[PDB]
Ligand binder design. Sequence first.
Ligand SMILES: CCCCCCCC/C=C\CCCCCCCC(=O)O
Ligand SMILES: COc1cccc(C#Cc2cccc(C)n2)c1
Length: 410
Amino acid sequence: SPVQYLRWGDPAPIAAVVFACLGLLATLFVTVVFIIYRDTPVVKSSSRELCYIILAGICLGYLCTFCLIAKPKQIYCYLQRIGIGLSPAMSYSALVTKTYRAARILAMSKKNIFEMLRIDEGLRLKIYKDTEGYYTIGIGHLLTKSPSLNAAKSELDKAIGRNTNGVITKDEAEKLFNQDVDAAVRGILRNAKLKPVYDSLDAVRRAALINMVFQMGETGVAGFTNSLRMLQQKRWDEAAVNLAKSRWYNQTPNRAKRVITTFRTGTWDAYKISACAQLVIAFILICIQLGIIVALFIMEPPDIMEVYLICNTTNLGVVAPLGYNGLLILACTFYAFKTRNVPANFNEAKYIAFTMYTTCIIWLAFVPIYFGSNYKIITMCFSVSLSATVALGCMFVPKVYIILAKPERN
Ligand SMILES: CCCCCCCC/C=C\CCCCCCCC(=O)O
Ligand SMILES: COc1cccc(C#Cc2cccc(C)n2)c1
């Protein structure tokens, strides 16, 4: 009994149990809130079944402390190993597929704007110079600024990764273009006259504005005061009429028409231009961890060696599932970082990225702390729980807050 130990002067067992009980309550609160209000936008477009997997994992995480603070029964040693390896995998494997889909969606948006400008501006697959004499390739991608061709080729090879010999492919031109777009967005967001229109626009219409920026620069685009305002206020037809009066339209009519039409429809009509799969993959990434665990069960059978349950788990019995989860966390972080600025679903991505930043630190810190500790069971309890609380706190608590306290927003 954990109360005994507190009485005997050791408050660690009861503290761990309380942490886990509170963890279970909160996860229970959050889950029920998601069951009732699954009928709402803020939950529908986000993957519901995947969310449940993540919550289940967090739940099992907290449950792990009851496996570590236990009566001496054989099965608890089995449970410990199962729970400690499998519960992070459940959460992180469902999450990686979530961040992956968010990464594909984003990539295909970058592909569209690339095609837009391939059509409007064109690209060269071989090195050339701009009107200012600087070495350039693709859709106006600046390579270097020195007057030496070989310096451009080296810098290109550095950028692409193979020995290009001054010649690249279309996919590689896209690669370079993605950078230039990124930088282009930075500038718009650093421009007071342009930030509010860009923030308010949907994805397609954002590309149209970026298109204009590429043609005239920011200072030129900011000169369409009235039109930008109309766009910001969503008066699409009026913006179209207004922009068709400009000198821009009159100097480059063929291109301006496509851009204006894009602004007017929010579609790509002027340019030629699976949830179930997620569950199967998440299922697979989880079974792999189970495979590792079951294999270590056969190589190194669990055995007991009071309130603390000392099992005979070797360093390998810990490290192998730990390593695998570490890989999942790594993949999550990678994809989450990539999609960190994605505005969709009330900036859901910003929370997911922050969560993984924290997880990485917590897990990296766990290695020296745990393997240099003489209080391993309690270190494990707090660690699993902290990791589960970080996920629950940083990702689900804000969603619940929006649900219950902003019913006029969602
Ligand atoms: C952000 C990275 C994700 C988390 C890192 C995962 C940590 C697990 C991976 C490897 C840990 C290093 C191997 C264990 C050290 C053995 C210590 C010992 O037994 O002496
Ligand atoms: C950092 O120290 C450790 C060591 C080993 C395992 C863990 C863990 C975990 C876990 C469980 C369920 C849900 C989530 C998000 N995480 C933490």
